[PDB]
Amino acid sequence: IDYKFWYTQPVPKINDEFNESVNEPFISDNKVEDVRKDEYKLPPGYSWYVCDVKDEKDRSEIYTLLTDNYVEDDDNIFRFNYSAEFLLWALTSPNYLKTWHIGVKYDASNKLIGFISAIPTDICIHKRTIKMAEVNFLCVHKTLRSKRLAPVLIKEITRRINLENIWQAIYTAGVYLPKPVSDARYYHRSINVKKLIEIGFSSLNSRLTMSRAIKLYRVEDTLNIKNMRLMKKKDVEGVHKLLGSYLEQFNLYAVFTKEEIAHWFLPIENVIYTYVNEENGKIKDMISFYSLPSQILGNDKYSTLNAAYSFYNVTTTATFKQLMQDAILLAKRNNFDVFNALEVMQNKSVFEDLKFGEGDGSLKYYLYNWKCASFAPAHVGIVLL
Ligand SMILES: CCCCCCCCCCCCCC(=O)CSCCNC(=O)CCNC(=O)[C@H](O)C(C)(C)COP(=O)(O)OP(=O)(O)OC[C@H]1O[C@@H](n2cnc3c(N)ncnc32)[C@H](O)[C@@H]1OP(=O)(O)O
Ligand SMILES: Cc1cc(F)ccc1-c1ccc2[nH]nc(CN(C)C)c2c1
Ligand SMILES: [Cl-]
Ligand SMILES: [Mg+2]
């Protein structure tokens, strides 16, 4: 297609290909003093709104907008239903700015109809660490689609990020845009087989009857790593060294400070689950997965698919297969129906043996204002929510 908005932006054109000797901005020597001070103009009757995600009621508003209008699969069966507490965690990480949590209201009803957000993160791309904004939760109400609101939201957050002297961004989407640095398919491991069959997500056939499908996905309720336990505050330093070390191998990863490790990993029920194996007061292995339910549209029996999404997993005392087998069992113990992972890091290597199935699409990783070589998803070492 044309990408008439995206081609005005500092991102690669559809045919751009850079070798590994190239790792730099499209536009360098930017000047904070030159950034527009005026808000981008919205159509008549709509206004910017600065959301306070720590206020329950403003946070409820964002929650309702996403619950009704956020991402669906291509068949419009499932819609992501991030919980309000999950949105609080995702948006209030260390050094967050309230002014990068941007809503648009329709003045006559006072209702929120659009949203976009960013948080700051140090991102290492091909061994250069850059202060960036991670952009997420871009949403326009279903009644106002294809009216070119989204570029307004994007330009307005880019302006507010640039005020902080930040000139690069990282973002992910299932849709193809100019132009991915990497592309990772997702895979799903069934936990509650029967439920997934009954809502249409998984299938039977003359060979695979219901009883046989259930048996296929049965797991033993005993951990490979016996001492794996919920992460506690005392474990923050050990997680930071274990994970920090591990992530240096990849082409793309966040550089976490200790404060970021406590925020992104300390457990919160129905939001983030992290488990650790401690030997001698050292953290030797970790598992983590976050909770992202999908609302089920038009199923008479079920309204919610409870799904655990693999986050960061590191083993030094087991095989990666054994670690991920434990991650599936811990998701099962926590009532999840399915365990979802992308082919990033070492994940793809355990998919066949641990009975994952290939999904319907892929997640694309993108950088704004950064020119570099693209790479296979095994070299991606970051997971965005
Ligand atoms: C230095 C700092 C830099 C900061 C900024 C970094 C960049 C951040 C970029 C954002 C990253 C967010 C990451 C993220 O949140 C995670 S990906 C999830 C995005 N959210 C949804 O999918 C929710 C359901 N859909 C919608 O709400 C609407 O369809 C949205 C709002 C998606 C588009 O609204 P619409 O009513 O359907 O469409 P128009 O207003 O008419 O706009 C059409 C223009 O929007 C382009 N478009 C469509 N989807 C996009 C997507 N997912 N990223 C970027 N661009 C997207 C499209 O290519 C077109 O441009 P083109 O004509 O050139 O092709
Ligand atoms: C289905 C799935 C499975 C999986 F294991 C990992 C990711 C996805 C998925 C696909 C499309 C998406 N669009 N936006 C999001 C939310 N963020 C990542 C921004 C998103 C996530
Ligand atoms: Cl403009
Ligand atoms: Mg629109």
- Rounded Cα distance between 207 and 194, Å, is 16
Its sign, for the CA torsion 296, 300, 303, 304, is: negative
Cβ of 311 closer than 6 Å to ligand 1, yes or no, is no
- Rounded Cα distance between 114 and 154, Å, is 11
Phi, psi of 9 (to 5 degrees): -100, 155
Cβ of 70 closer than 6 Å to ligand 1, yes or no, is yes
Residue type present at position 310: S
> With 0-12 CB in 10 A as exposed, 13-18 as middle and 19+ as buried, what is 112?
buried
CB 51 within 8 A of CB 64: no
Ligand nearest the Cα of residue 158 is 1
Which technique? X-ray
CA of 31 to the centre of ligand 3 (A): 18
Task: Tokens for 380, please give them.
Answer: 């991606």
Pocket perturbation via mutation, ligand 2, pick of 73, 134, 172 by most ligand atoms within 8 A of CB: 172
CB proximity list for 110: less than 8 A, separation 6 or greater: none
Cβ of 334 closer than 6 Å to ligand 2, yes or no, is no
Establish whether 243 is an annotated binding residue. Answer: no
What is the CB neighbour count within 10 angstroms for residue 218? 8
- Rounded Cα distance between 180 and 170, Å, is 11
Nominal resolution (angstroms): 1.7
Q: State the distance between the two ends of the chain, measured CA to CA, in whole angstroms.
A: 28
Pocket perturbation via mutation, ligand 1, pick of 78, 138, 144, 159 by most ligand atoms within 8 A of CB: 138
- Rounded Cα distance between 239 and 282, Å, is 9
Q: Where are the domains of the chain?
A: 1-385
> With 0-12 CB in 10 A as exposed, 13-18 as middle and 19+ as buried, what is 77?
middle
Cβ of 342 closer than 6 Å to ligand 2, yes or no, is yes
Ligand nearest the Cα of residue 153 is 1
Helix axes 258-265, 236-247, angle to 10 degrees: 100
CA distances from 317 to 49, 235, 237, 280, 322 (A): 50, 17, 19, 13, 10
Cβ of 13 closer than 6 Å to ligand 1, yes or no, is no
Residue 321: which region, alpha, beta or left (left: phi > 0; alpha: psi -120 to 50)?
A: alpha
Of the candidates 340, 14, 10, 347, the one whose C-alpha atom is nearest the C-alpha of residue 190 is: 340
Establish whether 148 is an annotated binding residue. Answer: yes
Alpha carbons within 13 angstroms on the beta-carbon side of residue 81 total 15
- DSSP-derived letter for residue 33 is G
For residue 316, give the 3-state DSSP assignment.
coil
CA of 178 to the centre of ligand 3 (A): 18
What is the CB neighbour count within 10 angstroms for residue 352? 9
Atom of ligand 2 minimally distant from the CA of 362: 10
Its sign, for the CA torsion 266, 271, 277, 283, is: negative
1-385 classified as CATH 3.40.50.1820: no
